[PDB]
Amino acid sequence: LNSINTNPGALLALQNLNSTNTELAATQGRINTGKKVANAKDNGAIWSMAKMQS
Amino acid sequence: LNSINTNPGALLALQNLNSTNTELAATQGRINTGKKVANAKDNGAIWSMAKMQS
């Protein structure tokens, strides 16, 4: 709690900020690609379906 | 929907414009030859009949 050696609350705020940064990066990729499924990591089944479809 | 990668509506407008261009080409052909069936592609039975009678 009142420790100089560590502070858990900063670690939790860091986890929250990293979650926000990851969601922002995903939104950046969806904007710059124009696809919600741009590659196999987005969704492998729908991606393979679209590959055979195209 | 609101995609940048593709749009159905221009495709539908294009197939409609292509149908209009095809009808205009058929009209130009009927105008410049003066016959509703100028060749075997127009109507094979009527064309065979008219050619044997001619």
Side-chain angles (χ1 to χ4, degrees):
Chain A
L1 207 69
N2 305 315
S3 173
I4 55 190
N5 290 307
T6 187
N7 53 350
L11 296 164
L12 294 192
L14 198 71
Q15 300 177 27
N16 281 359
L17 174 52
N18 305 337
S19 185
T20 300
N21 287 332
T22 305
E23 182 167 29
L24 192 41
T27 300
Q28 276 159 201
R30 263 185 316 260
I31 282 154
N32 76 33
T33 57
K35 288 175 271 173
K36 64 182 181 293
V37 167
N39 58 103
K41 293 187 286 185
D42 295 357
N43 189 355
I46 301 299
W47 174 89
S48 45
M49 268 162 60
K51 297 296 289 183
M52 320 288 309
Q53 184 63 255
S54 296
Chain B
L1 266 189
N2 315 314
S3 182
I4 59 182
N5 311 324
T6 187
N7 83 2
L11 290 174
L12 303 161
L14 186 73
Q15 65 182 357
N16 289 140
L17 178 49
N18 288 323
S19 186
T20 306
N21 283 319
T22 307
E23 292 180 354
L24 182 59
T27 294
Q28 273 156 12
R30 270 193 299 280
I31 282 167
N32 67 44
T33 181
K35 295 199 280 213
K36 65 179 73 174
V37 297
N39 56 75
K41 277 180 314 172
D42 272 349
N43 205 312
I46 304 299
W47 174 102
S48 296
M49 265 163 80
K51 186 179 289 293
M52 305 282 318
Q53 184 178 2
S54 179

